[PDB]
A paper describes a structure:
SAP05 is an effector from a plant pathogenic phytoplasma that mediates the degradation of host transcription factors, including SPL and GATA family proteins, by hijacking the 26 S plant ubiquitin receptor RPN10 independently of substrate ubiquitination.
In the SAP05-AtRPN10 crystal structure, one asymmetric unit contains two SAP05-AtRPN10 binary complexes with almost identical architecture. Interestingly, the N-terminal loop (L1) of SAP05 becomes a β-strand by packing against its counterpart, forming an antiparallel β-sheet in the crystallographic packing. Appropriately, the α1 and α2 helices of vWA domain, which are not directly involved in the interactions with other subunits of the 19 S regulatory particle, pack against SAP05. While at the edge of α1 helix of vWA domain, the side chains of Gln27 and Glu31 are accommodated by hydrogen bonds with the backbones of Thr48 and Ser50 of SAP05, respectively. Of note, a number of water molecules permeated the Lobe2 and vWA interface, with multiple molecules mediating contacts between SAP05 and AtRPN10. As a result, this binary complex buries a total of 833Å2 of solvent accessible surface area. The results showed that the mutant E31A, L69T or L73D of AtRPN10 was unable to pull down SAP05, suggesting the prominent role of Glu31-mediated hydrogen bonding, and Leu69-, Leu73-mediated hydrophobic interactions in the recognition of SAP05. However, the substituted His and Ser residues, especially the bulky His, would induce steric hindrance with the SAP05 surface.
Residue numbers in the entry:
A (entry chain C), C (entry chain A): 33 to 133
B (entry chain D), D (entry chain B): 0 to 146, 148 to 193
């Protein structure tokens, strides 16, 4: 009955919003978003405003990716969403934000 | 820190939730509000615990007993099943049992009910369950949304009068309009305290 | 580590193609798609070209959903992709076909 | 049916597979080919078995031992890891071992290598391996794509000459052009025996 998506001990959490600005009120995640940027980003670490690295060839209902722990290679336009699923590097949750429609 | 509470969120997954009068669907508008509430409650105090239950579908179903693992909680909200009609009294009985068994009895107890569908119960019937919750130190928050059940706000507010103790329980009525459901609730004690 | 997505005993298999027409050479799935139809569909049962039911508010890059056994309610514009994940009803595999963007 | 065989597909997930000269990526062009091949082989004969192995990344990794469970097979191809360079000798040895211990010995044994990277081996060492494959009745199919060392076609061809047994092994050279990797392969003995 429960849906589950996993890569090893990392849980994959798909979250869908009609408007990305809704995430401004979503703690804790809001503190990692830079709401001025264009195109979906992932975080190399859990510093504030860390979601800045451009995901390669994203679905255009993808809004962004937040790994909740540990660090990973930080580069624009190299890692697709599928490869990022293999890049938790010890993070226990990979949050994938999707735009509804 | 400050307030320390275990909350059970009772979400409406009835057939009425397919309706697009709340854009894009009542179900999606509830999902965003529930997601925001879990983040706000878990980040309010690291010892708060949040659980989630569905009220309709193929029966009342606990998705998680109360936990502080935000990722585990949010993971429950993907792939919701939809159908039937809510079982409000059963869902309340189940949530209260989950709250009773909390490991850290220092926590206050709170049920949040998302009432997006018509309420079939009787007003007297709802008052007794309210009085029971109050006796057991269980607070209640009611989110009344959806579309033509005229007695619904009256019934829900009678539930509230019966459970309320020291301003700990609240009701929010929110029709569809320019603001999303979550945005209306952000201003109310459902989110502020 | 391996990627896993599932609902109970039902494996969720995500497959991605740059071009829907590549699916026409993809055995056995080329026999279940109905390529004359616009918008992604799912099947209510097993039959030739059974993927005919319109998925509600689909992601822009969703191409279709194939359940490999059993039966389920068959209606246009009612079930989202997420809700379909609960409607295997005994299917062992839910194939979700995506377009690379 | 009549052709009954067990196949190990060896896929290239080296750093070189990010190159966009095969649109949108060598990795995605390879993946679609592999998915089509798995479907074709499993539907050709319900007693065929297909396994999948990655050659590069953080060392050779068997994604699944040969099975006829198409869903289990295709599930391996979502969320691939990319990095490093291929270990072609280790891969071919691990493929051979998986095939040697197939449950149904009446199956023929075949390895398909997607060589999407430079070949860091000397002709004499490839001829040794193919000789060993031939001795143990294993056929080989080689897919040569991507760029940059001049001698890779000759080295791959030498490997093919040493393993080939009654025209059972084949090689395809496919450059970045109009027809995608999968389209080129469909009309070759990789798909058509």
């Amino acid at each position: 009955a429960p849906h589950e998506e996993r890569v090893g001990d990392m849980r994959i959490v798909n979250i869908t919003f009609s408007d990305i600005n809704s995430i401004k009120n979503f703690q804790p995640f809001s503190q990692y978003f830079d709401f001025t940027l264009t195109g979906p980003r992932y975080n190399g670490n859990i510093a504030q405003f860390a979601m800045i690295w451009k995901i390669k060839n994203p679905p255009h209902n993808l809004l962004g990716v937040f790994f909740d722990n540990n660090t990973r290679d930080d580069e624009d336009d190299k890692y697709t969403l599928e490869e990022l699923k293999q890049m938790g590097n010890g993070a226990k949750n990979m949050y994938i934000f999707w735009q509804y429609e | 820190g400050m307030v320390l509470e275990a909350t059970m969120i009772c979400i409406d997954n009835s057939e009425w939730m397919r309706n697009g009068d709340y854009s894009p669907s009542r179900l999606q508008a509830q999902t965003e509000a529930v997601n925001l509430l879990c983040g706000a409650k878990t980040q309010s105090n690291p010892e708060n615990t949040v659980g989630i239950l569905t009220m309709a579908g193929k029966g009342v179903r606990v998705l998680t007993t109360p936990t502080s693992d935000l990722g585990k909680i949010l993971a429950c909200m993907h792939g919701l099943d939809v159908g039937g009609e809510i079982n409000l009294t059963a869902a309340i009985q189940i949530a209260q049992l989950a709250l009773k068994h909390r490991q850290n009895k220092n926590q206050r107890q709170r049920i949040i009910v998302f009432a997006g569908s018509p309420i079939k119960y009787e007003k007297k019937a709802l008052e007794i369950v309210g009085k029971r919750l109050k006796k057991n130190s269980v607070s209640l928050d009611i989110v009344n949304f959806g579309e033509d059940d005229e007695e619904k706000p009256q019934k829900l507010e009678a539930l509230l009068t019966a459970v309320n103790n020291n301003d700990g329980s609240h009701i929010v009525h929110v029709p569809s309009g320019a603001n999303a459901l979550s945005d209306v609730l952000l201003s109310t004690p459902v989110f502020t305290g």
